[PDB]
Every structure is written in structure tokens, then in C-alpha cells.
Amino acid sequence: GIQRDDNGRRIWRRRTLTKKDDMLRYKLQRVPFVEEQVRKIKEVGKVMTMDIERLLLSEDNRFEFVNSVAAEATEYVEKNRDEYGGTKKAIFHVLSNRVNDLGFDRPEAYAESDPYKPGPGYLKEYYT
Amino acid sequence: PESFRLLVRELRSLALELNHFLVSEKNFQINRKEV
Amino acid sequence: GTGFNKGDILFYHREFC
Amino acid sequence: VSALERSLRLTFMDELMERARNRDPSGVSEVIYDMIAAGLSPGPRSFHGLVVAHALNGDEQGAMHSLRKELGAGQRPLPETMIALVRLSGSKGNAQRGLELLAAMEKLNYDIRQAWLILVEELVRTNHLEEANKVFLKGARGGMRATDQLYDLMIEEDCKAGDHSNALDISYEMEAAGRFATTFHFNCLLSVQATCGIP
Amino acid sequence: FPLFQLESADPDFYKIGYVRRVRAYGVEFKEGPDGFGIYASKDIEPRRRARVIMEIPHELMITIRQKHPWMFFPDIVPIGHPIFDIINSTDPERDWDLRLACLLLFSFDREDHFWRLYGDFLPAADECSSLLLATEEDLAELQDPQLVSTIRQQQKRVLEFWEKNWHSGVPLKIKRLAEDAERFIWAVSIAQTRCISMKTRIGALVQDLNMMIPYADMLNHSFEPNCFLHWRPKDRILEVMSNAGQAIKKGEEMTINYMPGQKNNMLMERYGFSTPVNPWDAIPFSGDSRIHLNSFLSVFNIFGLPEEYYHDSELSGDDSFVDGAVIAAARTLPTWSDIDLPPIPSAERKAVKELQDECRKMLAEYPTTSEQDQKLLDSLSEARTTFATAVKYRMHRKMFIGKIIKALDIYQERLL
Amino acid sequence: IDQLELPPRIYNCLKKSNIHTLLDLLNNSQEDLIKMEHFHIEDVKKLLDILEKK
Numbered sequence: 001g002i003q004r005d006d007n008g009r010r011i012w013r014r015r016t017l018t019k020k021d022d023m024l025r026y027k028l029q030r031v032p033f034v035e036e037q038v039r040k041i042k043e044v045g046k047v048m049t050m051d052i053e054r055l056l057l058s059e060d061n062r063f064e065f066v067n068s069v070a071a072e073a074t075e076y077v078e079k080n081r082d083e084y085g086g087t088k089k090a091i092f093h094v095l096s097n098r099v100n101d102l103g104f105d106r107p108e109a110y111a112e113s114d115p116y117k118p119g120p121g122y123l124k125e126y127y128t
Numbered sequence: 129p130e131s132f133r134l135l136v137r138e139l140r141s142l143a144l145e146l147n148h149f150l151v152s153e154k155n156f157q158i159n160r161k162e163v
Numbered sequence: 164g165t166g167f168n169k170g171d172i173l174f175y176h177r178e179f180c
Numbered sequence: 181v182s183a184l185e186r187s188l189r190l191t192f193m194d195e196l197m198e199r200a201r202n203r204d205p206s207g208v209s210e211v212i213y214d215m216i217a218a219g220l221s222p223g224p225r226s227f228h229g230l231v232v233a234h235a236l237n238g239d240e241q242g243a244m245h246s247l248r249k250e251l252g253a254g255q256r257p258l259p260e261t262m263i264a265l266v267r268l269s270g271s272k273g274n275a276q277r278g279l280e281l282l283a284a285m286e287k288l289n290y291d292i293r294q295a296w297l298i299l300v301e302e303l304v305r306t307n308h309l310e311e312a313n314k315v316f317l318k319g320a321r322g323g324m325r326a327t328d329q330l331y332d333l334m335i336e337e338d339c340k341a342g343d344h345s346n347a348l349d350i351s352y353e354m355e356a357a358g359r360f361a362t363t364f365h366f367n368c369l370l371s372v373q374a375t376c377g378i379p
Numbered sequence: 380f381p382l383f384q385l386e387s388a389d390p391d392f393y394k395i396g397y398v399r400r401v402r403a404y405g406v407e408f409k410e411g412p413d414g415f416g417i418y419a420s421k422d423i424e425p426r427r428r429a430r431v432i433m434e435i436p437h438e439l440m441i442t443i444r445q446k447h448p449w450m451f452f453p454d455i456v457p458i459g460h461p462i463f464d465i466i467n468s469t470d471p472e473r474d475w476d477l478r479l480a481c482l483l484l485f486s487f488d489r490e491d492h493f494w495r496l497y498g499d500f501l502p503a504a505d506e507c508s509s510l511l512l513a514t515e516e517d518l519a520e521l522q523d524p525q526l527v528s529t530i531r532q533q534q535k536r537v538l539e540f541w542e543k544n545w546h547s548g549v550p551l552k553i554k555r556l557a558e559d560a561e562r563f564i565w566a567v568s569i570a571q572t573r574c575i576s577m578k579t580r581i582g583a584l585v586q587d588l589n590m591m592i593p594y595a596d597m598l599n600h601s602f603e604p605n606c607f608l609h610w611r612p613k614d615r616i617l618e619v620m621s622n623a624g625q626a627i628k629k630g631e632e633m634t635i636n637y638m639p640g641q642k643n644n645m646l647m648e649r650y651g652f653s654t655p656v657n658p659w660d661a662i663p664f665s666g667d668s669r670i671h672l673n674s675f676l677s678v679f680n681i682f683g684l685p686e687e688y689y690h691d692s693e694l695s696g697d698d699s700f701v702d703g704a705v706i707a708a709a710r711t712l713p714t715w716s717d718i719d720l721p722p723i724p725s726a727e728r729k730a731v732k733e734l735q736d737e738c739r740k741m742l743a744e745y746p747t748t749s750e751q752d753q754k755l756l757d758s759l760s761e762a763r764t765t766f767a768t769a770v771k772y773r774m775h776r777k778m779f780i781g782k783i784i785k786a787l788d789i790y791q792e793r794l795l
Numbered sequence: 796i797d798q799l800e801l802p803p804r805i806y807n808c809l810k811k812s813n814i815h816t817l818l819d820l821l822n823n824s825q826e827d828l829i830k831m832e833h834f835h836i837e838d839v840k841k842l843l844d845i846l847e848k849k
């Protein structure tokens with residue numbers, strides 16, 4: 001097992017696949033043309049939808065999950081009243097905090113803004 | 129609630145009383161709710 | 164649903180120095 | 181530390197610890213002044229012998245005064261020294277002093293879980309169940325997890341006294357900590373629920 | 380300005396799991412002369428809750444029920460296969476490792492099974508540290524007759540099972556699993572050293588399982604782990620979670636507690652390794668001389684109840700001395716306690732001296748010392764893995780007894 | 796970078812990589828410049844010296 005040659009450096013057998021996995025070729029690839037789709041997914045708020053499903057996989061009962069989130073949200077508003085109700089929503093803050101607690105990274109309260117707004121007074125108009 | 133408080137009065141017109149009691153799970157004391 | 168199952172010593176006792 | 185200093189400390193601490201165990205707070209005071217005369221500085225373990233000697237003779241005021249001497253000398257009391265004072269406070273039913281000392285241990289950055297357990301059993305043993313419940317709930321609601329033996333002690337003693345409100349509060353905290361109630365604990369609550377006239 | 384300013388495992392090791400939904404977060408698999416390990420590839424910052432380190436899908440595991448009847452999750456053994464009869468003929472209590480070994484060898488024979496690929500990263504017969512692979516000369520270096528007899532019984536039990544079930548008349552689909560006894564012994568060694576037992580819920584069925592879990596059997600053991608395993612029933616994923624609130628530095632090894640409360644001889648019998656800082660290791664004292672338990676704990680800042688002893692590392696600053704060995708010393712030394720009675724220093728010195736003499740009497744039972752064993756390991760060039768494991772075991776026990784003599788010396792002086 | 800006295804081989808490499816200004820060159824590390832073809836380690840010191848002298 002333990003082998004040292006001449007100069008005291010231990011020499012050892014590096015473990016390798018030494019076998020063929022056909023799943024390696026056809027699965028570690030990528031589609032190149034989803035930039036528009038990715039940007040709309042974030043725009044419509046679909047990312048938090050996946051995060052909610054992620055959090056519910058760690059929960060035994062979805063009704064106690066709902067109650068716990070509301071309880072945590074109530075605590076945020078009492079602690080800092082003026083920071084919530086506009087661009088930052090307390091329930092959205094709770095959900096993003098709970099995703100970050102798992103070690104993943106999300107923007108605070110999923111809040112994002114349009115960088116191409118042509119100054120104050122201008123509202124983006126939605127094409128139904 | 130106004131829907132239930134109004135119901136109690138209409139039942140009182142028929143000589144029936146409808147009391148709501150809360151039994152404490154801690155000390156078992158009965159509280160009559162103001163209806 | 165969500166309604167189921169009810170939803171100072173050591174102060175003023177320091178070294179004079 | 182020289183060899184001469186170590187030799188004197190051994191014989192000074194031999195005499196001091198032989199009078200603390202003799203339940204003689206007065207003698208433990210004489211040796212400390214002997215140490216001061218010799219120039220030796222009384223450390224945390226010399227004032228521990230003074231606290232213990234007073235504590236063993238049921239003397240809460242002298243033991244508290246000894247702790248003030250230790251703090252006034254700039255020494256840091258040992259975790260065992262605080263536990264001796266906390267256990268003494270419970271034996272006299274002084275829950276306020278016992279809670280004040282627990283706050284000091286947190287300030288001294290010690291671990292108050294063991295001293296909190298000792299405080300609660302002393303109050304229960306000395307028939308201060310009402311005070312014991314106040315101290316136990318504060319620790320349990322504060323996040324500390326009690327021992328399984330103390331959980332079974334608090335629930336049973338409250339239910340023997342007809343105190344369902346405290347026994348139900350504790351059993352809720354026992355499960356929140358992570359210890360699920362068994363048939364024994366339920367039988368304690370039922371012993372009181374069966375006499376309330378509401379089946 | 381930016382212009383003016385342990386080898387990584389085979390890349391295919393993670394990839395074969397990754398294409399089958401294995402996820403690792405902030406960790407990397409690194410290989411060294413002593414084997415694989417999992418290390419933080421970056422600074423893992425503390426959070427309010429436990430962070431997900433690894434996710435392993437259930438379908439990549441080999442699991443069997445701990446308790447009779449033997450059901451496999453996922454069920455890979457066909458109905459009527461002769462391997463089930465071999466698994467079913469085992470002792471329900473003692474032969475859990477034989478049952479897992481049969482499943483493991485059967486899995487290597489399946490073309491679609493993941494462990495056909497994952498098996499190439501398992502230690503070979505000359506690289507596994509299990510004492511089932513140890514020769515009689517390797518057991519001679521243990522210097523522990525009780526452990527040696529335990530291993531010999533294990534080797535006898537494993538061999539007799541192979542001879543009974545892999546005789547000449549068995550079908551070819553059975554013969555090709557374990558063509559030789561050493562192949563079956565190796566499988567049992569893999570089963571013992573890598574099996575993870577947990578209580579899981581699968582669907583609506585809650586049961587205890589013995590599990591072979593890839594990429595989580597690469598976590599090394601620590602009695603102060605920074606990670607723990609968590610079964611996620613909803614999607615059938617084993618989670619490796621770092622401790623909540625614990626900061627993990629880049630390059631730090633990720634560890635779990637294989638066997639809480641177990642001594643080094645138990646770690647040697649099961650996993651073929653020992654630790655010098657095992658907080659549960661015991662030493663046989665006469666009990667004639669006793670020290671003050673409360674003083675010893677406070678001198679070294681050991682807090683908590685006896686079953687949860689821990690070192691308040693923030694109350695010592697830089698005292699590297701206190702570790703699991705001193706905690707083990709607190710549990711194994713003869714102690715007295717009288718509520719709040721203080722100890723007389725002169726009477727405690729006599730006990731400390733007598734305890735140190737008894738500690739040196741035990742070190743004198745060993746023909747060599749712990750330094751001479753340490754340099755023997757450095758001088759090795761053609762030693763079996765189990766030989767070095769046997770030497771590390773006896774050296775760790777010597778290092779433990781030596782730590783007790785050092786701790787008693789510190790305690791005796793700090794009692795002034 | 797046109798106004799630094801860089802050798803023509805170095806200049807063509809930086810322009811090929813769309814490094815135009817002094818600030819663009821600074822933000823590039825020493826490993827990235829080696830990644831560029833025809834620009835090697837022997838060229839770092841002479842380029843650093845020109846920026847050292849500047």
C-alpha cells in the first residue's frame with residue numbers, strides 16, 4: 001500500500017474511470033441561444049417560483065411552511081417598518097433570505113429594475 | 129362578527145340563547161365571549 | 164390548512180487600580 | 181514563578197483549602213491576610229475557598245461579600261465558584277439572586293447551561309416550585325435544552341400540585357427542544373385534566 | 380494595478396455523478412496517498428442555517444433494509460435471482476456487511492448500474508485500510524489481543540460465507556461475482572468501511588437502511604465534524620450539510636462523524652483507522668488514586684455535561700493542548716466529586732503522581748515508543764496499508780497515554 | 796497604447812486582443828497576456844519595464 005521511492009516522496013495509484021461512460025459525451029454540453037428566454041424568466045419572476053419549490057422539498061408540511069414564512073415576515077415589518085411595501089416586499093425578502101441560508105445566492109427580495117428607463121416620469125407600458 | 133352577532137339577536141327573539149364559551153387549555157377556566 | 168393545529172453584578176465591582 | 185514562591189503557595193493553599201472544607205470562613209479569611217503579608221497575590225482559587233466556606237455554612241451574605249472581594253481584587257471567578265453561589269441561592273429560594281449570578285456567568289463568557297440546571301433542581305428540592313417554574317421557563321424559552329431527568333421532574337411536580345398551566349407550558353417547550361412527550365408525561369397532564377369537570 | 384501584481388481527483392469522478400444529478404457546492408474531491416477526500420474549494424461563509432454541500436440522488440445508492448425482511452432500495456435484484464437466496468441466508472444481526480457485499484458484487488456485474496463506474500474509484504485490495512484484508516503479520520503490529528481476536532473472527536466469518544455459497548455447483552451468474560475469496564473479502568471490506576446507516580422515509584415507508592452512498596463515502600471521519608448527513612424524503616436525495624453558523628475555510632476538509640461515542644478499537648474494527656484525539660478512548664486505571672473532576676474540567680475549560688463534553692476554545696486563546704484526548708482523559712481518569720467540596724492541593728498531588736506512574740507503567744508495556752513508531756512509518760517503503768494502519772493504531776494509544784501524563788502535569792500546577 | 800514605445804510585435808498582440816487604452820492594459824493580469832498567442836513570458840518583463848518607466 002504505502003510506497004516511497006528513493007527520495008521519500010510517497011508514490012500512489014491515482015484512481016481513474018478506466019471504463020466507458022456513454023453519458024459523459026452527450027450530457028456535458030450546452031444550448032447557445034437561450035439569452036432572450038433567460039432574461040424573460042427573471043423579468044416575470046419565474047426564478048422565485050423554482051426557489052419556492054426548492055424550499056418546499058425540505059418541508060414536511062406545506063401549510064406549516066406558509067405559516068412560518070408569514071411569521072418571519074411579520075417580524076421584519078415590526079423591526080424595520082419603512083423599508084417594506086414598495087420595491088422591497090417582506091414576503092419576498094423572507095423567501096430570498098431562506099434561499100441564501102441554504103448557501104445559494106439570490107438578490108435581496110428578488111427586486112430588479114429597468115436600466116433603460118428614459119428618466120423620471122416614464123412608465124414602461126405592457127404589450128398585452 | 130356582525131354576521132354572527134346579528135344572528136344571536138334574531139335567535140333571542142325566539143327565546144333561544146346562543147352562548148360562545150372558550151375553555152382554556154391551561155387552567156380549564158371557562159370564558160364567555162362578548163357576543 | 165394553515166388553520167390546522169392552531170396555525171447587575173460585575174458592575175461597580177471592578178479593581179480600584 | 182520561582183521555586184520558593186511555589187513552595188509557599190502550596191503550604192498557604194494547603195491551609196486555606198483545609199479550612200474551607202472545615203466550614204470555617206473566618207479561618208479562610210486569616211490565611212488570605214497571611215498571603216497578603218507574605219506578598220503573595222490571592223488568585224481565583226484562593227477566593228473560591230472563601231466563597232465555598234461561606235456557602236457550606238448556609239451563608240448567602242458572606243459568600244456574596246466574598247465574591248465582591250474577588251471582583252474587587254481584579255481576579256476572575258472560576259466557573260465552579262459561580263456554581264457554588266448559584267446552588268446556594270437556590271437552596272434559600274433566592275431566584276432573583278440565582279438569576280443575577282447566571283447573568284454574570286454569561287458576562288464572564290462561561291457556559292450557564294449546567295448552572296441553570298442546578299438552580300432549578302435546588303428550587304424544586306427546597307419546595308420553591310413556583311420560583312423553579314419561573315427560572316426553568318426563562319431558560320427553556322431562552323433556548324437552553326434541559327436534561328430529560330429534569331423535564332420529567334418539572335412536569336410531574338407541577339401536576340402533583342395541580343398546576344396544569346405550567347406543566348403544559350414545559351411539555352410544549354420540551355418538544356420544541358426535540359424531546360417528544362411519552363405516555364408518562366401525558367399521564368401527568370391527564371391526572372389534572374380528569375378533575376376539571378369537562379370530560 | 381492587476382498588471383503590476385493532494386491532487387485534484389480525476390475530472391471524470393465528479394462528472395459521472397454530475398450527469399446523474401449529483402451536485403457538489405463549494406467543495407472539490409482531492410486525492411492523496413492516503414486516499415480520497417472532500418475539501419472546501421472556497422471560503423464557505425456561515426449562514427443562519429445549515430448549507431447544502433452535496434446532493435446525492437437515491438438511484439445512485441445501494442441500500443438494503445437493516446431489519447428483516449431484506450428489501451433493496453432501489454430494487455435491483457430480479458425476482459428469482461440466486462443472489463437473493465445468498466443474501467437471505469445471512470444472520471440478521473451480524474451479517475449486514477455480507478448482505479451489502481453481495482449487493483455490491485452484484486451491482487458491479489450489472490451493465491447499467493452506476494457502481495460499475497463508481498467502483499473504479501473504490502480503494503483496491505492493497506489500498507483499503509480494513510483489517511479484514513490484514514495478514515497475520517499486520518495483526519501482530521496492533522499490540523491488542525482483544526482487537527486481534529475480533530478481526531480473526533471477522534475474517535473467519537467472511538471466508539466461511541464465501542466457501543459455503545460460492546462452491547463449485549453454484550450458477551455461473553453467481554461464480555462470476557466472487558471468483559476468489561479475496562474478491563469477496565474485498566467486497567466485505569468495502570461494505571464495512573463505507574456503509575452509512577440512516578433512518579429514511581421513502582414515499583410513505585419509514586425504515587432503517589444500510590446504504591452505500593457514492594461521493595458521501597468520500598467524506599472522512601472527525602469527532603468534531605463540520606458536516607452532517609440529512610435525508611431529504613421528498614425528492615429522495617441525501618444531503619451533506621455543513622453545520623449551521625460554522626465558517627469553513629478554503630482547503631478545509633469536510634468531515635462527518637462516522638460513529639458517535641465509539642472508541643478507536645471500534646473505529647479499527649469497522650473502518651480500519653484510529654484517531655489520536657478520540658474523545659471516547661479509555662484507559663484502565665486501578666481507581667486507587669482519584670483527581671477532582673470539577674477542577675480538571677475547569678483547568679482545561681472543558682464544559683458541558685459528561686456525555687457532551689466540549690472545549691471552550693475561546694476561553695483558552697492559544698492553548699493548543701486541549702483536544703479530544705484531554706476530553707477523553709476527563710471521562711477515563713479516576714475522579715471524585717462532592718458537589719462543591721474543594722480539593723486539598725497536597726492530596727491531589729499524590730493522586731496525580733500515582734496516576735502518572737500508572738500511565739508510565741502502561742507505556743512500558745509497549746516494546747517501542749510513539750516516536751519510534753512515528754519514524755518507523757516514515758521509513759516504510761514496501762508496507763501494506765494495513766501494516767501502517769496497525770502501527771498508527773498503537774502509536775495513537777501511546778500518544779493518548781502520553782497526553783494524559785502531560786495533562787495531569789498541567790492540572791497539578793494550575794491547581795495553585 | 797499607441798503612445799507607449801512598445802515593440803511592434805507586442806503592439807499587434809494587444810490590438811488583436813482589443814486592448815486599446817492604458818487602463819485596458821493595466822486591468823489585464825500577467826497570466827492573461829501569456830494566454831495571447833506570440834506573447835510569452837520573455838515579453839512580460841520588457842512590457843512591464845516600459846510601464847515601470849512610464
Ligand SMILES: Nc1ncnc2c1ncn2[C@@H]1O[C@H](CSCC[C@H](N)C(=O)O)[C@@H](O)[C@H]1O
Binds near residue numbers: 414
Ligand atoms: N479520520 C480519518 N483518519 C484516517 N483514515 C480515515 C479517516 N476518515 C476516514 N478514513 C479512511 O477512509 C475510509 C472511509 S471511506 C472515506 C473515503 C476514503 N478515503 C475513500 O477512498 O473512499 C476508512 O476506511 C479510513 O481508512
